[PDB]
Design a protein around this nucleic acid. Structure first.
Ligand SMILES: [Mg+2]
Ligand SMILES: [Mg+2]
Lengths: 483, 219, 483, 219
RNA sequence: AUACU
RNA sequence: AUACU
């Protein structure tokens, strides 16, 4: 057949700079041009030791670390100072009073109970009360680094890996275990704090992680310069309200809505399939819009929005887009990682029909499907692998990298499905291009690898956070509360 | 120039399908050839080529054979017909090399059958450049296998072959007291091992399998 | 261990008469009380041949059939007439002009389509349309027979058995197949019509059933005397709203509430485990009260009532009891198909602490245990055998019968796991006796056998009917609309 | 007293458990006795009785054994502890008589082993009345089996056995092409054959199984 | 969906 | 839960 391998898209950095890796682009130009506040207060919550070495972490990278390794200088550039050349043009300032201690008795009392749910529940609740006591006044703690001691780390990790939780194909939330990260982000949704959760291995690799935690998580952290690259970027993302880099569309800019229809489960009542928009426009804002109970085919599995549910979902997505900008979406891109039912597709079409110059773009994605293609190697570019299989357009977007010199994976790449609906007025090539333009825009990392685009990748994060938000509570459409 | 192999087989089928109807839930052994299995559909009987007037297993009623071409029935748009036809193709593929290859329920594999204990057989197939052999009875017992999967792609019919190395367990015992031993051997270099295992697999060869496509351009 | 084998529960028949076989008690005494106003209109819906031979077959049994077989005269007594020897003493007459026709073209247009859902959908819609055109005026059709021709029979049965539906243990609705019975009873809930559904084999034993229907259902009718025993009893049960028999125990004669908590999925939205009460009092009235979206343990499986949900559900069961009779329950019995969670049990105790003198007891019944206790056989009684497993009361009620003279089953019996909760204030033998007392109150039958008591046997029927009742629609607590 | 047999097997256990904790999750082999089995709990390497200095096959941590009495861990109010003890007893039972009993992953059965093809090894055991023989090697090949389960029942640690015939597979042909031959012809009379097959299974007899209870009245 | 197992 | 496969 015809084999198509697309190139890397262009990410905008600073003021009119071309595309590199997210680290190298964020070293010569910095974040986007908007005159916001240059001060982010990074009030750390933990015990005395974690607050002390978090302050030592902030002090020791204000000059600059020069960690490196292996042979490729493109994969591991160093992380220089945070206060002299700094691309953010920002002060990473820590103030007294915001550094609130957790003593030692409370850490023992939350690390000694053998219940997996209850321990992470009190660990969430005590620090949520601490952040609430921070919110009353004194300063403006824009972010809050959540530093976890070794006992707390082991407790909240073994509450997850030893709870024997199960996974599901269409459940876009995770593996049913009590998640410290999702619970903290859910209970901090009413808070004004975009919080960041770290470990002390990120701070100092002098204390050993226990063997059970090492084996049950396959933990192998990077070097010193490689660990602060994905942390300070997440710190500037959360405490400013500005996205650091900007993606650039190709097939006409106009307006765009790459709404990632996914169906998470919320662990409040019936473990509903109440779904989420996870809308990402042409620039990258994560408009999260949960909806009502999506219908299921059988026994609460294989979800799909009903016709009325689909038009209500699309109507609130269009309402969010028209609230943020004074222009209706000229193109709506449904991205389901599952098959398209006829009722759901008809509802989405009927909702899109009341839109001028509309462009329905429906794509089927399915995980764990076995058909290996392009049986070659690294030399023939293997990242953007895609073959037109007479209709369906199977694609794996992870593999060998140009401009690297080596294959960063430790296993073989795995493909997904790319099958356009019959109502879609676009070929599989241009939808493949739009899938391979949703690239390098994850704000959880600075990598240039990808196996899930951000309406599909961000589905896991949205379902992680919205699992623990109860009924009748207003949720936030700002993406800073998720990753 | 930069073409590469494809893990599915372009099946070639004749103009004879022998549609029928039965009442069974899939085997009453048999008394002749090994093509007396319950290769049936979900409610009807979907047989294949046969040298007798009756269909396979001689259990379907007489004078209930449609005998229509492949293009009339096998090419449908609903996914249920594709799933039924591919399950039928897997059933008629598993019991096609029954004298040489066996099927195991876990991992969905057609492996080489052991003739004796401590086997030292070799499998040799010809090639244009040289002759390449394969040892598939290595004892340290494991043999070689593959897994079949479903694929149509509108114009044709395909069985997808996944060459599992089957390093874990072989022999008369179902499992060696749950003792696996495997690792990553294949690499993304200019050559590969899986495709190789696809190419040197020839025991699967009216299911006349065509050669895998291997036509690609990588500009 | 100690083994108790309890005796058969007795029933009240007629005016002050003891218990014989459920056909024999319904042959010498008749229904319970109030032998006045004996009018039942039995207006049939079907084609011309089906209505004609339905009336003909009613005319044959109006004199009395003398069918018999095998050797035991207790198992197969004959069916009496409908005149002076009629046990019901009721007018089993067809209403003139209520013979709603279905012609022939509509039957072929239902039986010709290849959709399993849609064929039974428009069959239900056609029957509902004729019933709505019947109940507008002219007479009072208290009951209706929905008599099905063979062409409709094969269609509505192969829509069920060839839909490849799945089953799960905690669901009582069935097997996700499109059920003609459940859909007809759900769409006839707003009507004043208790409706009886029969097959052409029940009317005339001259038309053959196709081999696919025979093999896919294992259909084997009994004789003519044994076929109308289970039909005219159900016909009189669904007319005038009067039960024909009741139990007579002496443990809880002040008040009793054997509320059979079960859970069903309704095929409208997410197939939510919206639960039901299925309350059966000391006489056997099936107060059906659907609850709310009960919490599940993981991914919508293993349902349990939340504490607020449990107290609300028990509160509306008590409200229904206090609406029907001027006395609050004092003997509320919970009968679950799964083990009691702590939250649900605590909610039930919190709800029942509001009530008066409490003799509350809770029992777990788990299906398919693997301990074949009492390997003795037929010459000792095997029906109603259980073993005190040092706290548990593992029980099977199916087995050999003393009055029948033979084992009526064709397979080995399989038991249930009777496990009292720790807050129950009664011994395991008393709870086993109370479960065994819920035997011969099945209005879907007229024989003496049990493997599930009617708070759990009726769970199947309630989840069958309430699977299709839509949201926001008032349901009926009368048990006539279920079996 | 019309006493009847129960299909549960009481366990008599010594006052030694050797609780330990090592990072392992399921079976290493090649050291000593076939008792090289990963008797693995939920995160703790809690094995059973230790004949040598180190438990199992010196895989566990030597300086972590507990050696507590039977009533400490075999008796527990938590259902999760009972399930873990049940799984540990099943793993000790399956790999105790593995020289002549095999285990299959489907239907969960411990069946009799076949030494070769066309087996003539019918099993004879002594009883109180006379010697009782059983055709456990019947060829037309099928053998005899049972499915095990464990639960506590608040006073002991009984093993429940379901005496099912094997009826399928065996070593002559891997899976007989998915074709069992059975009818379920059991008897409901003054006696039975399931009670029979429970009695004529003496092949599990440290996991010292007591006699099944059979203490009943049945008025 | 006449009933049970 | 600094990241990715
Ligand atoms: Mg992050
Ligand atoms: Mg009935």
């Amino acid at each position: 057949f015809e084999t198509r391998i697309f190139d890397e898209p262009e990410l905008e950095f600073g003021d009119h700079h071309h595309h590199q890796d997210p680290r190298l682009g964020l070293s010569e130009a910095g974040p986007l041009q908007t005159f916001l506040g240059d001060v982010i207060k990074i009030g750390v919550v933990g015990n005395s030791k974690t607050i002390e070495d978090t302050r030592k972490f902030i002090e020791t990278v204000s000059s600059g670390v020069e960690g490196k390794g292996e042979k490729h200088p493109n994969m591991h550039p160093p992380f220089p100072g945070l206060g002299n050349q700094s691309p953010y043009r920002c002060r990473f300032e820590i103030e007294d009073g915001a550094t609130a201690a957790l003593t030692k008795s409370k850490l023992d009392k939350i690390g000694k109970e053998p219940d997996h749910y209850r321990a992470v529940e009190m660990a969430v609740d005590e620090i949520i009360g601490e952040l609430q006591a921070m919110d009353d006044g004194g300063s403006r703690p824009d972010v809050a680094i959540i530093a976890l001691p070794v006992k707390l780390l082991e407790r909240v990790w073994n509450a997850k890996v030893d709870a024997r939780g199960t996974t599901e194909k269409s459940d876009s939330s995770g593996s049913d275990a009590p998640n410290f990260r999702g619970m903290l982000k859910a209970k901090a949704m009413g808070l004004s704090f975009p919080i960041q959760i770290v470990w002390e291995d990120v701070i100092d690799d002098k204390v050993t992680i226990p063997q059970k935690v090492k084996e049950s998580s396959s933990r192998k952290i990077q070097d010193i310069a490689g660990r602060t690259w994905n942390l300070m970027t997440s710190l500037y993302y959360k405490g400013s309200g500005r996205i650091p880099w900007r993606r650039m569309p190709l097939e006409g800019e106009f307006s765009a809505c790459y709404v990632g229809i996914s169906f998470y489960r919320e662990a409040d009542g019936q473990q509903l399939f109440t779904s989420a928009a996870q809308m990402f426009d042409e620039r990258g804002r994560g408009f999260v819009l949960k909806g009502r109970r999506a219908r299921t085919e059988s026994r609460g599995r294989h979800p799909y929005m009903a016709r009325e549910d689909a038009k209500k979902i699309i109507e609130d997505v269009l309402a969010a887009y028209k609230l943020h900008h004074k222009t209706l979406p000229a193109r709506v891109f449904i991205l389901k990682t599952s098959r398209f039912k006829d009722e759901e597709a008809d509802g989405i079409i009927a909702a899109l029909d009341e839109a001028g110059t509309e462009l329905r773009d429906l794509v089927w994605v399915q995980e764990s499907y076995t058909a290996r293609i392009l049986r070659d190697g690294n030399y023939p570019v293997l990242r953007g692998t895609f073959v037109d299989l007479h209709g369906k357009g199977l694609l794996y977007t992870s593999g060998s990298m140009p401009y690297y010199g080596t294959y960063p994976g430790k296993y073989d790449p795995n493909p997904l499905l790319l099958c356009p609906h019959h109502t879609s007025e676009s070929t599989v090539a241009q939808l493949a291009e739009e899938i391979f333009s949703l690239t390098k825009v994850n704000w959880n990392s600075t990598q240039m690898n990808q196996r899930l685009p951000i309406p599909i990748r961000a589905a896991r994060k949205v379902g992680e956070v919205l699992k623990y938000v109860g009924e009748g509570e207003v949720i936030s459409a700002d993406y800073r509360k998720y990753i | 120039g930069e073409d590469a192999l494809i893990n599915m087989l372009p099946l070639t089928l004749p103009n004879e399908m022998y549609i029928a109807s039965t009442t069974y839930e899939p085997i009453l052994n048999g008394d002749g050839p090994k093509r007396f299995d319950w290769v049936i559909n979900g409610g009807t009987f979907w047989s294949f080529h046969d040298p007798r007037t009756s269909a396979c297993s001689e259990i379907v009623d007489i004078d209930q054979v449609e005998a229509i071409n492949t293009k009339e029935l096998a090419l449908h748009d609903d996914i249920d017909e594709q799933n039924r036809f591919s399950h039928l193709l897997r059933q008629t593929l598993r019991y096609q090399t029954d004298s040489d290859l066996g099927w195991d329920k876990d991992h969905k594999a057609l492996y080489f059958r052991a003739i004796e204990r401590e086997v030292s057989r070799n499998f040799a197939y010809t090639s244009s450049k040289k002759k390449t052999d394969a040892n598939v009875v290595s004892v340290f017992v494991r043999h070689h296998a593959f897994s079949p999967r479903f694929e149509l792609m509108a114009d044709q019919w395909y069985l997808i072959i996944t060459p599992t190395y089957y390093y874990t367990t072989n022999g008369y015992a179902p499992h060696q007291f749950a003792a696996p031993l495997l690792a990553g051997k294949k690499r993304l270099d200019k050559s590969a091992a899986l495709r190789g295992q696809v190419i040197m697999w020839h025991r699967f060869l009216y299911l006349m399998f065509g050669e895998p496509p291997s036509i690609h351009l990588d500009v």
